[PDB]
Symmetry: C5
Subunit: 306 residues, 5 copies
């Protein structure tokens, strides 16, 4: 059972694709294992670069294919490098850029709690064990977090053994491969969305209610039709700029709320008026519920967060 030591260097995690639950990772992979001692020119280790590596394979030099279990597509491999030591051991170092997959929940969108994952595992080797895994998130935590879209925490390794129940016609015990699993926790940067979506959406819902401080009945009603048109004009601006998803986010709900608030008002206003015993006996208290549901909406809103 060959012992391999992997070292992943994360350089940048970007381009999150909300719909496909994808994110790009740029970094380097380093694998080290020991082989039958070799005669290296001079004596100091031999450095084999790109094109050359493929040659050394054709001459027996074995090199284990380490797959990225959770990769969408196939990584963009940069510079490959083989460092051959005289005492046997071999060190493989290559830079990569790939798109990884993982279960991502964007229900609370504006305030996300996501976690980026890598999953290494020998493509075709039952007894080729992954010794120790080390990840260098040499990125800067409290650096300039208000410049980048996501804020992080700290790395997280975890080696394990995966058992497949439908392999080759093998029975003895060939069905356990060692898988390195890296995890990075990150939180989304609320800022932008608060000051450009939540806030103004609120001022719209607020000024929405000021339709009650209108005297006439026609004014009270005809104005909420211009108010309806405003929430639609907003849902457009919101949608054209927000990430498409299969489910509704928080913001998606604030928009529904704005739709109900205005439909509620429409009902009250066309109720207050025709709920009479004459013709214009608008219930002085209902027509003056200018403070009834404006705060009664912070009660329906503080129950959806409970």
């Amino acid at each position: 059972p060959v012992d391999v030591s992997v070292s992943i260097f994360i350089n940048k995690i970007y381009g999150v694709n909300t719909l496909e639950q994808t994110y790009k990772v740029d970094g380097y992979i380093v694998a080290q294992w020991t082989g039958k001692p070799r005669k290296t020119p001079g004596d100091k280790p031999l450095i084999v670069e790109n094109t050359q590596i493929e040659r050394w394979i054709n001459n027996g030099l074995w090199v284990p294919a380490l797959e990225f279990i959770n990769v969408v597509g196939s990584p963009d491999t940069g510079n490959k490098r083989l460092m051959l030591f005289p005492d046997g051991r071999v060190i493989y170092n290559a830079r990569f850029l790939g798109s990884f997959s993982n279960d991502m929940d964007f229900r609370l969108f504006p305030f996300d709690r996501q976690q980026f994952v890598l999953e290494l595992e020998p493509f075709s080797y039952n007894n080729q064990q992954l010794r120790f895994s080390d990840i260098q998130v040499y990125t800067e935590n409290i650096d300039n977090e208000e410049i980048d879209e996501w804020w992080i925490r700290k790395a997280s390794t975890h080696i394990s053994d995966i058992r497949y129940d439908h392999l080759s016609s093998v029975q003895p015990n060939q069905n356990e491969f060692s898988r390195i699993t890296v995890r990075i926790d990150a939180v989304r940067n609320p800022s932008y969305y608060l000051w450009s979506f939540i806030l103004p959406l609120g001022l719209i819902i607020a000024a929405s209610w000021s339709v009650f401080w209108l005297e006439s009945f026609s004014e009270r009603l005809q104005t909420s039709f211009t108010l309806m048109l405003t929430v639609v004009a907003y849902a457009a601006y919101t949608s054209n700029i927000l990430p498409r998803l299969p489910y509704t986010t928080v913001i998606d709900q604030m928009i529904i709320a704005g739709y109900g608030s205005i439909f509620a008002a429409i009902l009250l206003i066309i109720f207050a008026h025709h709920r009479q015993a004459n013709g214009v006996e608008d219930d002085l208290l209902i027509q003056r519920c200018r403070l009834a549901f404006p705060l009664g909406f912070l009660a329906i809103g503080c129950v959806l967060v409970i």
Copy 2:
């Protein structure tokens, strides 16, 4: 007639392209067949990885080219692997990611009933039979379906023989290739569209009718012009965010309905008024059809679903 045993491992079905009727599939293919026993170093099976396989072909080792009948483009092949057994048999294993085609009907868009298909078939072999086909949809049915865009059911195999009537100048019987056909049934997740499109669209159509609870004639009419402008502002928001298609979906019809409801009203309102024997004799009952077509629209709507 060589016997081949295929095994498809579906890992993720994503990126559905409504307009081109495309969808992406990530997984592995495993093909097994038996050949003339061989002398493998040691004795335990020989493992040939990437670069190497192409070499073994140049030395006679045959490997059937298995085409993906319904693939748009050419699959993104990851790690290839040849496992050569001493008793002959050969096992080919490779990871792939490709875009597949299939007839997709999106008439009832918000509520779709689609089915993802794969179609394997030897690219150039008449008598090379596909033995047994197995698919491991090791994805989780009732897991977190309210996180993913589509909900599934269960795999579905089916081997068969395809007959081409215009092949080489061959007559005997060379015109029957065996094709593996995999089918996966899936249903779209209505949620999002209901709570962010259907609902608010209804509140717009509802409050649309409240144009009748207006006293004056000018108010009753001039307001439906702001109401018209509202449905348009909605069709914009809807279109910019929904999947472009060559035909109309359900939502596309609700939008037409909102257009007709407002045009109907426009006709009634400019009828009730000028349908007099004086000048302002607005038919007290028609001007008060505030409950005539609001429910008479649930009759025109429940006949389109019949």
Copy 3:
């Protein structure tokens, strides 16, 4: 002069790019010609697949490069295959996906009459004649045309000889290559555009005129400003969803019409009023031209289609 027999199998014609006059074609190409008889292992034809073909070339086996005259870019080649017969003849079969060009006129957009073309021609061979060309449009005419964007008719071949006047320093007669030209005629599916663009645009133009059935002068005018705003809100929805072009379509003109109809009304309304001999002597007949240009617009519209 080598005789070559081509057979094109169109599998799907999609992704029309209005602006670049591009369209994608997926299918297979089959070329057959006869060479100096060969000794094939066994005796039955020899099958050379992908990688291998490039090898047989290096050993003399000649294979003519057949260019796709009208291809934007370079086709996405799938599986290549050489079938070598003992009696000489060679059969080349490969699957392709490319983007083709052609002059496309989208003037009557909603109702297009386009034609998809392919153009094969030996890249570097003067006397290498293309024998017979056959195209298998094994797609289904009256199948589910109301599911696909385009409706077709039937294939259409045509071999010819092209003469270039500026080739190599050759004089004898080297300047005539044989070009296969395939043509497929198609018509666009009006549906969607009628029920989602033409119709509602008409209800807007119709209800546009009902600005005359208003009593006051201020109402008659101030209302047409909200009517103007409506046609603009529509041109936005239309444009964001329709295909960008360098010229105006039919729909683009109906939009101009709605702009003139409203500007015409603006003139009449601000004429009828101030065309007096007092101050409010609104020409009873002009102010009541509620049926003058509404049908007088079907006369200006039925002359643009003449």
Copy 4:
């Protein structure tokens, strides 16, 4: 100093990228030079196609690398072809598709005067002279110009010598490479923009002024607020469909003009009214400047074109 004769065949110039000042060019390149006579099989010229050319290089056959100085990226090379003559001379022919750069000024957008350029130049050869350059714009001038976005004129060659002041540690005179420069002049097709942007934008500015033919003061003012909202609704439609740039076009200015015209009116209207010696003494002439700046706007507009 090797004499090379180049021949560029422009097939289609499309996809202009306003922001990056890019445009795509499809065509063929033909380079001819004479070498040490060779023994060609048979005697008639030898035809070397794709894969093969790379082989002949490995056997000494030299082939000058001709770079495309102004190419963004790297051309999409199609079919390559080497025609080797017995008398020495070699003819290189290959089809290409690349993205080229050039300084493009879109200040007068609707009416552009641009020029597409190509720039060939030996990548690594001081004394390898480019003999004669010929371009076949075998496209059709007055053909169907009202179908294509751009209208042309006629080709334009020009060979020259470029001097680099910072090359290798060479002094003698190695610093002059011959560069072929092709230029094609083209004009944009105004049509669409006039009938779908300029015209309707004018009818909006025109009907804008008719806010003066209103009696009351409140009507005269409150209506220009719906007029303001209209120009904005237009800038949206315009922007979403027009090409993003770093500077303002003509249309971009007409939109500013419409903004000023309405702000001007806002000032006059709120001046005429409060510029009294009572309360409602609206200067009969100013309130009746219904023809003052409507034509006084054709004076401010005919000075921006002077």
Copy 5:
């Protein structure tokens, strides 16, 4: 310690991707170092072009892999070229196009101060020193800056030594690689954004205030609802055309300001009216604060720039 002399020729810096903090760079790289003198055919330097270089490597000729530390992906390499001198020294010249990364702050968007950076560094060599670095920004400073999106200043080099604390199991001192760092300072072109966003946004905020010069109370309020709808209609036009970011820009704030100004007015107007001791005693001074916050907004605005 091999001495290498690099020379970077920047040809064009374009395609800034605000969200990913990326920018494209086209140019050539030139690396020179001296090796063991060689016998070159003739005597004058040997020119090795593309395909060939890979060959000379297989025959020992070493070529250091120089990585682009801050590259997203992997550069698009054009023509490679090896110039081998008899006296040893080797000169590597290749054209590239890659996407580079760097921290970019777009807080003051309309007026940006950004800096484009390149970072070279030997991929696998501890003692391979980079001698002198030279960059030829042979672009034209005060040329046509009002045609390009960005304005520059002047190049800026800087060689240094980077120390990695987690390399191979090496202790002596193998952990210091030499890195070339190029920096180019650039400023964004405000123009467009001023005349198409800032200006018209101001005329909207300006004319926003003229809601005070309205007599009635209903007019003063109902008009600000059409004014609100106007700022939203603007945020839409702005957003669809501006670069998506995770934070708010200057323009994003002017939009918030217009939202507050109108919400402020809404409060005042619904205060002035109901802040009585009767019913319509609108505080003659407050209702006439037509000059209170219009200039009192230039005070809140000149404190956000302080």
